[PDB]
Amino acid sequence: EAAAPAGPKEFTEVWNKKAPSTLIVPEFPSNYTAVKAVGEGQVHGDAFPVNFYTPHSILSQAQKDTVVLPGVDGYFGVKASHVPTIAQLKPGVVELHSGAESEKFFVSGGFAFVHPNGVTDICVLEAATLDQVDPAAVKSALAAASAAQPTDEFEQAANRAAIELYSALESAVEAKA
């Protein structure tokens, strides 16, 4: 039921009454986005724009044809027009495909969106390519993870997160292509 249409152009009607006219209207983050989700398009064939993001770095903004994301119910591939999906990702390998070549970023979690206008968005917190990872340090930390047993389940909420991140990192490079 839509009797309360909040919005950026509808913020200005109440702002022209209580707030004075001495200030210009404050900006909104929607005014800086050229791409939305509800206006269809952006596919034009077999490609779709993929925006792979960390908080500290924009890793990709090109157009791919296959994106393999490590969802919490397992890996899944995204073709040109996937179903609109909000998929929570576990630690695993985000795999991009523009053609015959593939780049394999290992991510630590964070969600992944597929939008009804065909655009997709991968939103992680730390994404290291596997050439930046060395396996000698990985399961030595799992040897420090799955051995200590604190019954405080705030620490084995972190230790469960430590186990599934390191163990998915071992098979990320031991199952090399």
């Binding site: 500290h56 630690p91 290992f106 630590s108 979690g109 964070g110 917190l125 730390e126 290291a128 050439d131 930046q132 990872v133 060395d134 340090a137 990985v138 930390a141 405080d152 389940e153 705030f154 620490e155 909420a157 972190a158 469960r160 997160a161 430590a162 991140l165 390191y166 990192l169």
Partner: protein, 72 residues
Amino acid sequence: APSGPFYRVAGMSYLRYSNICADLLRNVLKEPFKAKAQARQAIHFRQAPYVDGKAGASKVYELENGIPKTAN
């Protein structure tokens, strides 16, 4: 008390959970790349709750090793 995922039933927020997974990925990187990890991992700020305009003293975070994985 509450339900949801394994971090949410422990009182751990998603921002604390996804950062605990984040820096634990940064701990096992190669040393040319792990040098660029504790820069974006350090937490250096302070806070003060204002009850009526008079704070108290402080709560100073000076951690260079990431978000606290201990209880909170």
